[PDB]
Every structure is written in C-alpha cells, then in structure tokens.
Design a protein around this ligand. Structure first.
Ligand SMILES: O=c1ccn([C@H]2C[C@H](O)[C@@H](COP(=O)(O)OP(=O)(O)O)O2)c(=O)[nH]1
Ligand SMILES: O=c1ccn([C@H]2C[C@H](O)[C@@H](COP(=O)(O)OP(=O)(O)O)O2)c(=O)[nH]1
Lengths: 128, 125, 128
C-alpha cells in the first residue's frame, strides 16, 4: 500500500522510507521556543494522504522529553484518512515542563499507520 | 459486530464509520490548576468478544480545557461490562478549568486484543 | 507465538500473563523516590525478545496517577522487535506531579504486543 506526502517546502528534510514496519520520525518545520508551562503547536512540515481505511497515530519519541522537556498534550494524536487536503499539515502539540528551544529539522515525534476500527452497531440497552 | 451501551440517565447525550467516537462529560466538573479529577462519561458498555477500547483526548481538548489525560491512553477491556462499569476520563488541569455536562472531552475506538502468546523465562537473550 | 523474558536478577517478581489477551502489568525493579517536578527513568527489570514482526506498547495503569502522582512523559512507549539484546532492559519514563515514592514490585504500567505496520511506499507529491 502507499502514502502520498507533500512537504511544506523544499528545505524540509524528506522522511524515512517505510519498507520495514518501524515507526517514522517527524521533524520541526521551523525553530520553536517554548517557555516553561506554555504550549505550542509545533509544525511538522508534512501533509499526507494515508491509504483508505487507515489512520495514523503520533506519539513522542523515547528521547523527546530528555532532550526537549516537552509532553504531548493529546497523548497520542490521531490523523484520519480524511485529513488528506493540500493544506492539511501535521502538528505536534507540545507543552513545555521547562524552558526549551526546538530547532528546525529536529526529530520531535514519531508515527505509524493502523487499520481503522471495523463497522460497529451501537445499540442502547437499559441494563447490562 | 455490535456494542451494547447503557447510559447513566436520560439526560446523557446519545453517542455516534471507522472514525473514533466522541465521549462526553456526564456532569459539570470544575478542576483547579494542578488538581486532578475523574470526569464521568456517563456510559457503560459491553464490547465485542475479544475486543478492548482505547480512550485518548480529542485533539482540541487541551486548547479548550487545559487538561491532559493522566494515564495517556485508557484501555477498557471486554470484561469491564457490568451494569455499574461506567467509563471515566482521568483529567489533570494545567490551568483553572470548567468542564460542562455534555462537552465532548475524549474519544474512543475498539481494537482486537493481543493474540495468544506464551511468556518463557530465559536466562540469556 | 511466544515472548522470551530475561529478568535483571532473582529478586524481580516474575510476570504472569492472562490466557485471554489482557494487557500485562510490569513492575518497578527497585524503590524509586521522585520529587515534585523531577523526572526518573523507572527500571522495570525485564528485557524481552518479542515475536518477529511485532512491537510492544507501554502505557500507565489507570491507577498509577492516583497511587503515585506520575505521568508517562513519552505518552506511550514503543518497544520494537529489534530491542532484544541481553542488556535491553525496559523502563517507565516518569515525571512526578507531587513528591512520591514507588516501591520495588509495584505494578506501575502495562504492555501489550501489536503487529508492526505493513510495508508501505512513501511517495512524494507536489500537491494533494
Ligand atoms: O481511562 C480509563 C481507563 C480505564 N477505565 C475503566 C476500565 C478500568 O477497568 C476501570 C478501572 O480499572 P482498575 O481496576 O483501576 O485497574 P485496571 O486498569 O488493571 O482494571 O476503569 C476508564 O474508565 N477510563
Ligand atoms: O517507554 C519506553 C520506550 C522505549 N524503551 C526502550 C526501547 C527503546 O529502543 C529504548 C530507547 O532507545 P532510543 O534508541 O532512544 O529510541 P527508539 O528505539 O525508540 O528509536 O528504550 C523503554 O524502555 N521504555
């Protein structure tokens, strides 16, 4: 199956090929400084069309906290197959636990795709 | 396949493919900066056999409410299916905040449970 | 399908799993004290060889916040099949929101396996 990827501009680092199944590192599109106890949506400089029936999950890297002192505010980001527009760029929602500087090109998070959940009928009941 | 849902009361907003599903606050919940509260979602559910639920914030949850989910991602097992097994969102407030009854606060999907696997102890890898 | 598990030493409480595919709790390998607003990588005292083509995901137990006042700084840890060396021990990255103590043996996080994402073609495009 395939992913189509548009970059914000020619200066964004092209990302890893995916012929092995490993999660794929995504990078800051520009310098971002965040003060302690402040929040920033860090641009990742990438828009994607994911295979039909799939979604992507985004979490921080293992060394993200050590190096940058940030947590991801939504825990795990979900990118649906439908977020496939030419302006549908990806962002890492960063809350800083300490004063920090993130530089353009720094790897800041990682993503993989997964099959979206199957067809389900929700049915209300009065008692389990 | 089917999920059976019981709602806490008649006032809870009935929920609603493949997309993750929005869950909502069952009552008003005020949380001060640096304080924690379990936010009731006013739903109990009987998931399909051999499936579990995963619960994460919505993308806009932090912008709108200034809360983070303290367990990162909640796992609701197939076996949490009793009549009193209502779901909760564990919220830590990074600023003073006010959640209102009915506000969408998190979202869930189901996923097949891990395969049968045997843990074997070895003294070296 | 199996997982090979090596323990740090004899004093580590062996980890049992449920026949059903429940997530599996892991424990702290030693007594760890963490101050408010400090970070510690909490050793779990286990190294594992996961089945081929699988990865593990590590999240906190629902009760970890209430019992120990810590969040997991990477949201959800990804353990690849490749992290199967004799000194590839697993850790829970903990940030304390209050002064806390975690005891040796305490069940603090939980894991399951999942198949790795399938081989996919990343293909750059000028517009979506
Ligand atoms: O974010 C979550 C996570 C879990 N639960 C439900 C399912 C869970 O079984 C119960 C509380 O479980 P527990 O007995 O505290 O521990 P365990 O998670 O091993 O069941 O709450 C939630 O409502 N929200
Ligand atoms: O929550 C976690 C996340 C990962 N690891 C392990 C697996 C990982 O391989 C190693 C850190 O190595 P890395 O090379 O910084 O990251 P990765 O292997 O994720 O690229 O720590 C943990 O013990 N706990």
């Amino acid at each position: 199956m395939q992913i189509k990827i548009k970059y914000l501009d020619e200066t964004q680092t092209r990302i890893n090929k995916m012929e092995q199944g490993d999660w794929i590192d995504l990078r800051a599109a520009e310098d971002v400084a965040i003060k302690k106890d402040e929040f920033k949506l860090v641009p990742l400089g990438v828009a994607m069309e994911l295979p039909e029936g799939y979604e992507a999950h985004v979490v921080p890297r293992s060394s993200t906290y050590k190096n940058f002192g940030v947590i991801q505010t939504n825990s795990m980001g979900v990118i649906d197959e439908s977020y496939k527009g030419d302006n549908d760029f990806w962002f890492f929602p960063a809350y800083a636990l300490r004063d920090t500087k993130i530089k353009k090109g720094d790897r800041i998070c990682q993503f993989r795709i997964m099959k979206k959940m199957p067809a389900v009928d929700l049915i209300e009941v009065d008692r389990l």
